[PDB]
Amino acid sequence: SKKGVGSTKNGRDSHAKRLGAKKADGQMIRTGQIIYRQRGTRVYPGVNVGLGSDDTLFALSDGLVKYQKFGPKQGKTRVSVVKHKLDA
Amino acid sequence: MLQPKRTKYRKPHNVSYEGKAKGNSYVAFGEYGLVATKGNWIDARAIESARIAISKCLGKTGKMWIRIFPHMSKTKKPLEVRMGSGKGNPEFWVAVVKQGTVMFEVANIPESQMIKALTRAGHKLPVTWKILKREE
RNA sequence: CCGAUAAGG
RNA sequence: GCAUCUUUAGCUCAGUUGGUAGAGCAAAUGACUCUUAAUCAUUGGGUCGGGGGUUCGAGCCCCUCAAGAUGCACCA
RNA sequence: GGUUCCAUGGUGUAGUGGAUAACAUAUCUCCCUGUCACGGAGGGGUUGCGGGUUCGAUUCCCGUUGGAACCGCCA
RNA sequence: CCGCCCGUCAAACUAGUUAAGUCGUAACAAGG
RNA sequence: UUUGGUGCCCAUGUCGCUGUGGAAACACCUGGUUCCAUUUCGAACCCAGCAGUUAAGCACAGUGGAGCCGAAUGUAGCUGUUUCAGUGAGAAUAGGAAAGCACCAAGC
RNA sequence: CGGUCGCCUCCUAAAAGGUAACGGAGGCGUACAAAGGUACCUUCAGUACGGUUGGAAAUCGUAUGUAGAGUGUAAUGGUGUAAGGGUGCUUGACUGUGAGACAUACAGGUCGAACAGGUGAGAAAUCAGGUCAUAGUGAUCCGGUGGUCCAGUAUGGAAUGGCCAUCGCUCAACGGAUAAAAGCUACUCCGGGGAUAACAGGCUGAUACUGCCCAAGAGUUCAUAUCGACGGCAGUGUUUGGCACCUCGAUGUCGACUCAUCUCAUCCUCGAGCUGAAGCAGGUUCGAAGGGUUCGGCUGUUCGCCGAUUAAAGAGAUACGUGAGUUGGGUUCAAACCGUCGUGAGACAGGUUGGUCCCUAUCUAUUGUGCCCGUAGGAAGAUUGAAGAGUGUUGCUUCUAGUA
RNA sequence: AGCGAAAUUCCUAGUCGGGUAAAUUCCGUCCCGCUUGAAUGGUGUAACCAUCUCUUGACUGUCUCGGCUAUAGACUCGGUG
RNA sequence: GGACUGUUUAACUAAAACACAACUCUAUGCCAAACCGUAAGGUGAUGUAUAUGGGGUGACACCUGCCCAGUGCUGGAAGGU
RNA sequence: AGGGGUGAAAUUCCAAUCGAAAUCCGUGAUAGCUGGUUCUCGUCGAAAUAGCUUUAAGGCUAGCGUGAGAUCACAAAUAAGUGGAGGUAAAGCUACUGAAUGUAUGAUGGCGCCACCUAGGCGUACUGAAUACAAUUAAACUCUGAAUGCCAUUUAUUUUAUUCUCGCAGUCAGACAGUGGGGGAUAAGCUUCAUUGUCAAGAGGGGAAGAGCCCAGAUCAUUAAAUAAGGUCCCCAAAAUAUACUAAGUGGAAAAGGAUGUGAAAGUGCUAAAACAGCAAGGAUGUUGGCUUAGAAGCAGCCAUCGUUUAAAGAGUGCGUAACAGCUCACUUGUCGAGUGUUUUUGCGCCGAAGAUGUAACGGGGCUAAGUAUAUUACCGAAUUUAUGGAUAAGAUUUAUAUC
Ligand SMILES: *C(=O)[C@@H](N)CCCC[NH3+]
Ligand SMILES: [K+]
Ligand SMILES: [Mg+2]
Ligand SMILES: [Mg+2]
Ligand SMILES: [Mg+2]
Ligand SMILES: [Mg+2]
Ligand SMILES: [Mg+2]
Ligand SMILES: [Mg+2]
Ligand SMILES: [Mg+2]
Ligand SMILES: [Mg+2]
Ligand SMILES: [Mg+2]
Ligand SMILES: [Mg+2]
Ligand SMILES: [Mg+2]
Ligand SMILES: [Mg+2]
Ligand SMILES: [Mg+2]
Ligand SMILES: [Mg+2]
Ligand SMILES: [Mg+2]
Ligand SMILES: [Mg+2]
Ligand SMILES: [Mg+2]
Ligand SMILES: [Mg+2]
Ligand SMILES: [Mg+2]
Ligand SMILES: [Mg+2]
Ligand SMILES: [Mg+2]
Ligand SMILES: [Mg+2]
Ligand SMILES: [Mg+2]
Ligand SMILES: [Mg+2]
Ligand SMILES: [Mg+2]
Ligand SMILES: [Mg+2]
Ligand SMILES: [Mg+2]
Ligand SMILES: [Mg+2]
Ligand SMILES: [Mg+2]
Ligand SMILES: [Mg+2]
Ligand SMILES: [Mg+2]
Ligand SMILES: [Mg+2]
Ligand SMILES: [Mg+2]
Ligand SMILES: [Mg+2]
Ligand SMILES: [Mg+2]
Ligand SMILES: [Mg+2]
Ligand SMILES: [Mg+2]
Ligand SMILES: [Mg+2]
Ligand SMILES: [Mg+2]
Ligand SMILES: [Mg+2]
Ligand SMILES: [Mg+2]
Ligand SMILES: [Mg+2]
Ligand SMILES: [Mg+2]
Ligand SMILES: [Mg+2]
Ligand SMILES: [Mg+2]
Ligand SMILES: [Mg+2]
Ligand SMILES: [Mg+2]
Ligand SMILES: [Mg+2]
Ligand SMILES: [Mg+2]
Ligand SMILES: [Mg+2]
Ligand SMILES: [Mg+2]
Ligand SMILES: [Mg+2]
Ligand SMILES: [Mg+2]
Ligand SMILES: [Mg+2]
Ligand SMILES: [Mg+2]
Ligand SMILES: [Mg+2]
Ligand SMILES: [Mg+2]
Ligand SMILES: [Mg+2]
Ligand SMILES: [Mg+2]
Ligand SMILES: [Mg+2]
Ligand SMILES: [Mg+2]
Ligand SMILES: [Mg+2]
Ligand SMILES: [Mg+2]
Ligand SMILES: [Mg+2]
Ligand SMILES: [Mg+2]
Ligand SMILES: [Mg+2]
Ligand SMILES: [Mg+2]
Ligand SMILES: [Mg+2]
Ligand SMILES: [Mg+2]
Ligand SMILES: [Mg+2]
Ligand SMILES: [Mg+2]
Ligand SMILES: [Mg+2]
Ligand SMILES: [Mg+2]
Ligand SMILES: [Mg+2]
Ligand SMILES: [Mg+2]
Ligand SMILES: [Mg+2]
Ligand SMILES: [Mg+2]
Ligand SMILES: [Mg+2]
Ligand SMILES: [Mg+2]
Ligand SMILES: [Mg+2]
Ligand SMILES: [Mg+2]
Ligand SMILES: [Mg+2]
Ligand SMILES: [Mg+2]
Ligand SMILES: [Mg+2]
Ligand SMILES: [Mg+2]
Ligand SMILES: [Mg+2]
Ligand SMILES: [Mg+2]
Ligand SMILES: [Mg+2]
Ligand SMILES: [Mg+2]
Ligand SMILES: [Mg+2]
Ligand SMILES: [Mg+2]
Ligand SMILES: [Mg+2]
Ligand SMILES: [Mg+2]
Ligand SMILES: [Mg+2]
Ligand SMILES: [Mg+2]
Ligand SMILES: [Mg+2]
């Protein structure tokens, strides 16, 4: 005897968006490359770093990326692109 | 039968009883206590049996505290049912007892009755119990 | 249209 | 078998989900009438089936018995 | 064991696409009659429990009871 | 005639018998 | 060095309590006739002037009250190999703490 | 059969990203000419006090309060001078593009510096290629609409196409077979599968059965003579179950008959402890598997109820033992009818009548009986007995003694 | 209307009576007939059936319970195989 | 249970199944309806509604109740498509 | 006369065949499904994964293999150091959201008793807001918070490829073991994921026997040597010393629970001013207190749980008596002259422990060591390594066809 079985009601899931950090600290970067994909600003933008229509951080100039912790109780993260600054 | 009045989620993942003792490790309300030596899942039915045992073997002025509480529920699929078609329905509530958690404590009656009372409470529970006293 | 009227005296 | 329910004044049943019980009939009492019926008021009448346990407190919650009834096997 | 429907006054049933609940019987008061039935006038009485959404739930959503209607097969 | 009276249903005893049960009003007046 | 302005910082920078201060400046303040303004109010914003003013704000000294920060030891978890060597939290505690770093204008 | 089929959010997801299950919770197939863009101004909800209507809670004033407020929405993340609220002017909810990246099998998706044209806000710097962000969507083919600096089948047109923009699919089974499509087969057939079920085996032991631990109580009083709650720990594989490892180039599946064998958790017989054991007859526990453990009525039955006996009418295992030993009553072929379902062919662990059970034994196992050879010269007799096999049940009457 | 636990009844081995020492089958009756029922006909019906079902007399090896005898095999010898 | 005598699955089902005499409904006016073929031709029938074809029930006796909403069949004025 | 015939109807019969004859032809129908596919050697050598699929036993692309070419460093690996992202393990709940324990102050109601018909008041068997103290719980809680892992860079070393292009594939059924989880019941040799390994496609040695466990990676020959896991009484190659423990064949399978088994340790009480046990004596009075109970009065429930004498004595220690009573003990003293009593932490053992063919829960014989723990020096043990020789591939010196 099988006795019959009930039915499940929740078996739905969405595609996983590949968010997170893309360029790590110290890595050289050119303008227009993505540094951080997020839903809502988890990492604030600094100098030479822009914002998009999806809160995506992209570079604005050549240089080395660099994360600096700031904000109350050092709970806010900020990214920047320190220009090559070779300066001979 | 101790039972939470409401829960946000009917069917939670079971909580492991393997490990040392997180909280409820030292007698802090009474001065004699029933410590556990083997982590296990014990349900509200065993608590009520043990609590009723303590109360029947207590006196007219003894006072007791129950530390553990059956927060987590557990489910059980109905009999003769093949695997699939979702999780079963919640059946009984169990308190998670780890190795070293003081379950029951007693005070305000002589030592022999308290030792005897904790013994009858621990014979009602699956865990391997042990008597401990409160630090001065 | 128009039905009924408790028991023994 | 098993799981489930029921046992509540003389009878048929609500009790409420813990501060210890009423409803409708039956009985009686009056009132009422020549007297009754009927009516009307009023009214006494309980081991909450028996024990154990919880609780400060059990008709009320949990067990074991006693008597019946239910739903699941007189092996698909 | 699973699935669909229902729970509205004292009894039988409608409605409401959120802002509002009626019909009949029954009940009460008064005409009516020697009296009563029938008759006439007027009066009155309503969303199973919970929990969310909304400014607002009988209505919308998810659970919990009770009553039904369907199925539970092939070896 | 606010008289009389019939037949189902319900209860008991042995179709009958039963003080005050229920649904009608068939017959006795031109009984409508 | 002190006052005033401002950037960096984002409580060991706060909230509060007790006192002192103004020379220059900062401020309240004096009026709405001008530019400008109120979803209505010269309250605010904006004007043109410093009569009064140290309540405020502001600036200094004290205040361990609230808030914040938090050592060492030990412990829980981890990595290996052991059934012991590193890694080392959270909580708790002694305790610190009445901000700090630069630039500019004035008497110094 | 029921449920689901595309996209978005959280957890499982093990602190990069990714990661499944008929795992646990929810939503979407939009909304806004302002909820867009810009300039300026401005900052919670709640609570405390004080005040007509006015009430616990409408609005006002002051203070407190560090987000529990708002951010159209399901969640997550973000954001309290912000991305929240108000006002003025506007339409960048632009045209042609696009270096470089994210993520990806492809198709598609996401971010974007910067350039040219012409605008909006603003004194200017600057910002504006839709919204705080992630769901709000469908390929190709076919045909229709608007524009057009292209073609126009000898030439001029036209018809008909081309390019760009746009319209028609809960094509939702949502990478979409065709513009267009439901059922029965027990009258069946073919190719395969132990990739996958029904019988049995295997693993598990939820459930089932047996046992034990604590002692509340019941028991003329007394937990433990006999029971034993509320609880807990085991054993067996012994019911109902779970998995799908062996078998679909076939492992014959219920019951009955014949023959039985094994285990002990012992029904009788045998021995003993305790007793709420006077005697007789009992109750419970311990030891013990040598033997025995009946015949019938109804049902295919196992089971079960009933009748009469017995010392007793035990519980199980052995492919729920046993069809190359028997039977075929039952299940389950084709035939036929009843009830019910279906419009129907047909279907029902609903009911009933009828209905093909093959094999000469090669190996091994076993029951009997022989030949050869060995036992060291040969033969004829009589023995011991290592290792074994067979049987083992029990009742009634009398006496003891109507004695204890 | 008729019939009704039926070739139909799940619960159900329905209640009661009869048949037996004892009766899930049989006969009569009762009726909440889940889901009987009137030309896919309803209810009775003398005769008939290699039809189904139940009780019974005689009868018998069906059985308690097995035993004996005779043939053809099986078994031994010769031939085919 | 079938009224009966009969017929049936050659080679697993002989029956309650089929048939049967009987009842009823329906179509058919003769170049009849129905049927074989593509048609000729033919069966019906060298028959004529007391006749033929098809559907259902199945001796004999007593009965056959209500519903024309849906479907099927027949007829119908006009009207709409 | 066959998408036809016949059928008193069963899917009947139509040449031993009928859900639609037999035979030939289209035809070598089609089959994502079974089965089979034939000589040798050498080099290298997978996958059982993702997405889509009327797709799930199939197919395409990506991932993994192989052949050729390019890239020398900026490419890719192995170690050390540094920087960064994160929110898991843990921990915490006065840092939120839920759940939640006790104490104290207590809104609130229930419950009363009054007054008053509406404004209310005094206590609440009790419910319980908020606050303080102490303590808790969480995958979808976080004021915090690692390690590992991930990305990038620096240094050292190594390889021309794990990078790019082209040709040819196979693979889309996986299994088990350790670790972190989901479903299941903290069941499954269960199912679904992440990661480390083995098998698949891998022999050898250990595990008695075993695909997945441990040691490792087989070119061929050698009757050479050293070793890994594992082991050294015999089967079966190889051991001895020394120190303790076990008495159970424990070893050589098990839980809750129970026990004067034994060894070690750390404390505490008395003792030759006499210890403990036993023996010999006493072991009391009011009184038999009093309610209470038929009665209790040393031993029913009570009112409690008395006091003196005295060495000691209890409203008694039980038995027991209707109850007293009575026997008798807790307590004190004496013969007595060497050990006793208790607490805690540990090592090895006992019981709990019943299944079905035959010892059958060490592999067997056997073992009080041939069992357990420790220390020292040895040995055995693989197809591992070394040594001798034969064969062969690719790289170098170099061209004898020589050495690495
Ligand atoms: C049919 O119902 C079988 N599955 C039940 C067998 C029960 C045996 N105790
Ligand atoms: K098979
Ligand atoms: Mg996601
Ligand atoms: Mg009078
Ligand atoms: Mg069937
Ligand atoms: Mg001042
Ligand atoms: Mg379906
Ligand atoms: Mg992650
Ligand atoms: Mg990770
Ligand atoms: Mg939201
Ligand atoms: Mg605006
Ligand atoms: Mg906006
Ligand atoms: Mg088309
Ligand atoms: Mg032309
Ligand atoms: Mg699809
Ligand atoms: Mg897609
Ligand atoms: Mg086949
Ligand atoms: Mg299989
Ligand atoms: Mg099976
Ligand atoms: Mg078990
Ligand atoms: Mg006793
Ligand atoms: Mg087992
Ligand atoms: Mg059994
Ligand atoms: Mg599998
Ligand atoms: Mg097998
Ligand atoms: Mg075979
Ligand atoms: Mg065979
Ligand atoms: Mg066979
Ligand atoms: Mg025994
Ligand atoms: Mg013997
Ligand atoms: Mg008989
Ligand atoms: Mg079995
Ligand atoms: Mg069998
Ligand atoms: Mg058997
Ligand atoms: Mg079975
Ligand atoms: Mg056999
Ligand atoms: Mg057989
Ligand atoms: Mg045979
Ligand atoms: Mg056989
Ligand atoms: Mg048969
Ligand atoms: Mg037969
Ligand atoms: Mg048939
Ligand atoms: Mg029908
Ligand atoms: Mg022998
Ligand atoms: Mg009837
Ligand atoms: Mg009748
Ligand atoms: Mg019958
Ligand atoms: Mg009978
Ligand atoms: Mg029969
Ligand atoms: Mg009958
Ligand atoms: Mg019928
Ligand atoms: Mg009919
Ligand atoms: Mg009949
Ligand atoms: Mg016949
Ligand atoms: Mg012969
Ligand atoms: Mg011969
Ligand atoms: Mg016949
Ligand atoms: Mg015949
Ligand atoms: Mg035949
Ligand atoms: Mg025959
Ligand atoms: Mg013609
Ligand atoms: Mg003719
Ligand atoms: Mg017929
Ligand atoms: Mg008939
Ligand atoms: Mg009719
Ligand atoms: Mg009509
Ligand atoms: Mg018509
Ligand atoms: Mg065809
Ligand atoms: Mg047929
Ligand atoms: Mg033939
Ligand atoms: Mg072929
Ligand atoms: Mg095909
Ligand atoms: Mg190789
Ligand atoms: Mg692999
Ligand atoms: Mg993989
Ligand atoms: Mg396929
Ligand atoms: Mg490929
Ligand atoms: Mg945790
Ligand atoms: Mg909390
Ligand atoms: Mg896998
Ligand atoms: Mg798999
Ligand atoms: Mg695993
Ligand atoms: Mg798990
Ligand atoms: Mg798992
Ligand atoms: Mg597996
Ligand atoms: Mg393979
Ligand atoms: Mg191997
Ligand atoms: Mg081996
Ligand atoms: Mg090699
Ligand atoms: Mg050696
Ligand atoms: Mg070694
Ligand atoms: Mg040797
Ligand atoms: Mg052993
Ligand atoms: Mg001991
Ligand atoms: Mg010891
Ligand atoms: Mg073992
Ligand atoms: Mg060797
Ligand atoms: Mg080698």
Short mmCIF file of C-alpha atoms (C1' of nucleotides) in Angstrom, two decimals, chain K residues 59-233:
data_model
loop_
_atom_site.label_atom_id
_atom_site.label_comp_id
_atom_site.label_asym_id
_atom_site.label_seq_id
_atom_site.Cartn_x
_atom_site.Cartn_y
_atom_site.Cartn_z
"C1'" G K 59 21.38 14.73 -28.86
"C1'" C K 60 24.26 19.80 -29.13
"C1'" U K 61 27.73 23.28 -26.78
"C1'" A K 62 30.94 24.01 -22.61
"C1'" G K 63 34.38 21.06 -18.94
"C1'" C K 64 38.18 16.71 -18.82
"C1'" G K 65 41.97 13.46 -23.33
"C1'" U K 66 45.14 13.29 -27.62
"C1'" G K 67 48.13 15.17 -32.23
"C1'" A K 68 50.40 19.78 -34.50
"C1'" G K 69 51.95 24.94 -33.85
"C1'" A K 70 52.76 29.45 -31.07
"C1'" U K 71 53.68 32.25 -26.46
"C1'" C K 72 60.11 32.20 -22.28
"C1'" A K 73 57.90 35.61 -18.62
"C1'" C K 74 55.14 39.90 -18.01
"C1'" A K 75 52.11 32.63 -18.71
"C1'" A K 76 51.24 28.59 -15.28
"C1'" A K 77 52.64 25.75 -10.88
"C1'" U K 78 55.48 24.81 -5.66
"C1'" A K 79 57.02 27.39 -0.76
"C1'" A K 80 57.80 32.04 2.48
"C1'" G K 81 56.10 37.17 3.48
"C1'" U K 82 52.39 41.20 2.80
"C1'" G K 83 47.57 43.67 1.62
"C1'" G K 84 42.32 43.12 1.00
"C1'" A K 85 37.05 41.30 0.46
"C1'" G K 86 33.65 38.16 3.89
"C1'" G K 87 30.00 37.53 8.49
"C1'" U K 88 30.68 30.89 8.92
"C1'" A K 89 32.64 27.98 13.64
"C1'" A K 90 32.34 30.16 18.40
"C1'" A K 91 30.04 33.45 21.57
"C1'" G K 92 26.29 36.75 22.99
"C1'" C K 93 21.11 38.59 23.69
"C1'" U K 94 20.00 45.28 28.28
"C1'" A K 95 22.70 45.32 20.65
"C1'" C K 96 17.66 44.26 17.72
"C1'" U K 97 13.56 40.26 16.07
"C1'" G K 98 11.01 36.20 17.90
"C1'" A K 99 11.00 31.99 22.14
"C1'" A K 100 11.95 32.00 27.35
"C1'" U K 101 13.36 30.94 33.92
"C1'" G K 102 13.48 32.89 39.01
"C1'" U K 103 13.45 37.17 42.52
"C1'" A K 104 11.74 42.48 43.75
"C1'" U K 105 8.76 46.79 42.59
"C1'" G K 106 4.34 46.46 39.75
"C1'" A K 107 0.19 48.67 34.63
"C1'" U K 108 -3.56 44.98 33.73
"C1'" G K 109 -7.53 41.81 34.15
"C1'" G K 110 -10.09 37.62 36.78
"C1'" C K 111 -11.94 37.31 41.73
"C1'" G K 112 -14.51 39.27 45.52
"C1'" C K 113 -16.92 42.94 49.54
"C1'" C K 114 -19.28 47.83 49.46
"C1'" A K 115 -21.30 52.12 47.77
"C1'" C K 116 -23.33 53.88 43.28
"C1'" C K 117 -26.81 52.88 38.53
"C1'" U K 118 -22.52 55.69 37.39
"C1'" A K 119 -17.98 57.82 38.52
"C1'" G K 120 -15.92 54.34 41.53
"C1'" G K 121 -13.33 52.48 45.94
"C1'" C K 122 -10.37 48.29 49.88
"C1'" G K 123 -8.15 43.34 49.57
"C1'" U K 124 -7.00 39.92 45.97
"C1'" A K 125 -5.87 31.33 45.96
"C1'" C K 126 -4.47 34.45 41.27
"C1'" U K 127 -3.10 36.36 35.44
"C1'" G K 128 0.64 39.12 34.08
"C1'" A K 129 2.76 45.31 30.65
"C1'" A K 130 7.27 48.12 32.09
"C1'" U K 131 11.78 48.53 35.07
"C1'" A K 132 16.15 46.40 38.07
"C1'" C K 133 19.10 41.93 39.36
"C1'" A K 134 20.65 36.96 37.96
"C1'" A K 135 20.45 33.43 34.20
"C1'" U K 136 18.73 31.04 28.82
"C1'" U K 137 17.54 29.58 22.99
"C1'" A K 138 17.78 30.24 17.18
"C1'" A K 139 19.21 27.79 9.27
"C1'" A K 140 15.90 32.11 7.63
"C1'" C K 141 18.66 36.83 15.39
"C1'" U K 142 23.52 39.68 15.40
"C1'" C K 143 26.51 44.89 19.44
"C1'" U K 144 30.82 41.31 18.15
"C1'" G K 145 33.79 37.30 15.59
"C1'" A K 146 38.36 33.72 13.96
"C1'" A K 147 41.16 29.74 11.64
"C1'" U K 148 40.97 27.49 6.86
"C1'" G K 149 39.94 28.82 2.12
"C1'" C K 150 39.79 32.95 -2.03
"C1'" C K 151 41.88 37.24 -4.90
"C1'" A K 152 46.29 40.24 -5.92
"C1'" U K 153 51.18 41.46 -5.32
"C1'" U K 154 56.77 40.66 -3.64
"C1'" U K 155 61.03 37.07 -3.44
"C1'" A K 156 63.22 32.08 -4.61
"C1'" U K 157 62.77 27.65 -7.62
"C1'" U K 158 60.54 24.73 -11.59
"C1'" U K 159 57.65 23.72 -16.68
"C1'" U K 160 56.68 25.45 -22.17
"C1'" A K 161 52.66 24.35 -20.61
"C1'" U K 162 46.91 24.02 -16.76
"C1'" U K 163 47.35 30.16 -21.83
"C1'" C K 164 46.00 30.84 -27.30
"C1'" U K 165 44.77 28.43 -32.60
"C1'" C K 166 43.66 24.07 -35.56
"C1'" G K 167 42.46 18.23 -36.47
"C1'" C K 168 40.10 13.66 -33.92
"C1'" A K 169 37.54 12.03 -30.00
"C1'" G K 170 35.22 9.49 -25.73
"C1'" U K 171 32.18 10.94 -21.54
"C1'" C K 172 26.13 12.99 -19.74
"C1'" A K 173 23.78 5.35 -15.26
"C1'" G K 174 28.91 6.25 -10.99
"C1'" A K 175 30.58 3.53 -6.07
"C1'" C K 176 32.66 3.68 -1.26
"C1'" A K 177 35.81 5.88 3.11
"C1'" G K 178 36.96 10.58 6.21
"C1'" U K 179 35.12 15.51 7.10
"C1'" G K 180 30.46 19.92 7.09
"C1'" G K 181 25.25 19.79 6.25
"C1'" G K 182 19.98 19.06 3.90
"C1'" G K 183 15.66 15.03 3.43
"C1'" G K 184 14.92 10.42 6.77
"C1'" A K 185 14.01 8.95 12.84
"C1'" U K 186 21.68 11.72 14.85
"C1'" A K 187 18.11 4.45 10.60
"C1'" A K 188 19.72 2.26 6.30
"C1'" G K 189 25.47 -0.84 1.92
"C1'" C K 190 19.22 5.08 1.93
"C1'" U K 191 18.78 9.81 -1.02
"C1'" U K 192 20.78 14.83 -2.40
"C1'" C K 193 25.12 18.46 -2.09
"C1'" A K 194 30.56 20.78 -0.84
"C1'" U K 195 35.67 18.95 -0.13
"C1'" U K 196 39.82 15.49 0.48
"C1'" G K 197 41.30 10.16 -1.51
"C1'" U K 198 40.68 5.18 -3.74
"C1'" C K 199 38.06 2.09 -7.28
"C1'" A K 200 36.24 2.79 -11.97
"C1'" A K 201 40.74 2.46 -15.75
"C1'" G K 202 45.40 -0.38 -10.69
"C1'" A K 203 48.30 -5.46 -9.72
"C1'" G K 204 51.50 -6.00 -4.81
"C1'" G K 205 51.69 -6.22 1.15
"C1'" G K 206 48.07 -5.68 5.99
"C1'" G K 207 42.97 -6.44 7.16
"C1'" A K 208 41.44 -14.76 7.81
"C1'" A K 209 38.56 -14.29 3.33
"C1'" G K 210 36.59 -8.18 0.96
"C1'" A K 211 36.64 -2.99 -6.02
"C1'" G K 212 36.31 1.85 -2.58
"C1'" C K 213 39.86 1.20 4.49
"C1'" C K 214 45.91 1.55 5.61
"C1'" C K 215 51.03 1.17 3.23
"C1'" A K 216 52.22 2.24 -2.34
"C1'" G K 217 52.21 2.69 -7.84
"C1'" A K 218 53.76 -3.46 -11.69
"C1'" U K 219 59.41 -2.25 -18.32
"C1'" C K 220 61.58 -7.70 -18.24
"C1'" A K 221 64.96 -11.32 -15.71
"C1'" U K 222 67.92 -12.48 -10.63
"C1'" U K 223 66.79 -18.69 -5.33
"C1'" A K 224 70.75 -10.52 -4.06
"C1'" A K 225 70.40 -6.33 0.17
"C1'" A K 226 67.65 -2.22 3.21
"C1'" U K 227 62.70 -0.79 4.51
"C1'" A K 228 56.68 1.28 4.67
"C1'" A K 229 51.64 -0.34 6.80
"C1'" G K 230 51.44 -4.70 9.72
"C1'" G K 231 53.66 -8.30 12.85
"C1'" U K 232 57.47 -11.96 15.73
"C1'" C K 233 54.14 -19.63 20.67
#
